[PDB]
Amino acid sequence: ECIENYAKVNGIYIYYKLCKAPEEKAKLMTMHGGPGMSHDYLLSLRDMTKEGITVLFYDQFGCGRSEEPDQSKFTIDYGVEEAEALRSKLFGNEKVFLMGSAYGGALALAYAVKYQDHLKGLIVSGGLSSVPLTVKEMNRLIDELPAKYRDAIKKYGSSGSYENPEYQEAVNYFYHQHLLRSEDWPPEVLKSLEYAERRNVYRIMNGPNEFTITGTIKDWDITDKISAIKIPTLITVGEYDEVTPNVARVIHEKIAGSELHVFRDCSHLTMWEDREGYNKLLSDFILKHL
């Protein structure tokens, strides 16, 4: 029974869901990736209110239930302000934690650099700082994939036949390899991704999909600015995550006091797979740093 209210911010409206943890111990703000996705796939974090960890959720500009701003502010440097415009409006000046998944992590970082003065901790779940790099690394992945698909992707990809059947064939199978491990996609996620393939964001600011990043984010690469981040931090990732662990390192590398912890036998939506123990680590990370 989380208060799913709405909030007008920067000319446009935004939806936000937070299940106020019984005994307020820490306020963790969530940051979904994509872009163009939604928070619906990060709901599993509910197991965190138990630890008296309050958890807020929110669909970024034009994402999910929230509305899109002028197409002019279709960037990451924008999403940032939002998070703040929102946060501030939510609890004025208070010690808050952040958790960006994938893109949201990148964002999370991006935000972390400027409005760092408003942070207690920063949890990243398979995030990134240099889009180009992430991409470069995915190819490798694709390459490793079995000829049949490794060949379909490059083929139809190098032509725009993204709709092509043989293409999707790889895609789904691929997703069941770097996005979601040994299993069946849960509701929370579905609706999320479904959103992306319906909103105007993931279409313009991202690209046809995850490994076909053609949107307004391929240039982005603030790997150097992250160095500036000095507040405590946490980074996670899977052995076979679409955003390969090799990316995570860098971050962990450019930022001290970080304790990169790769999840064994886990993919991207780690917060679901070994979710059972996933939360812990985060909570463990939070609590302690108080």
């Binding site: 895609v171 997703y175 479904e194 393939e197």
Partner: peptide, 4 residues
């Protein structure tokens, strides 16, 4: 993103 896709699915089944």
């Amino acid at each position: 993103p896709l699915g089944g």
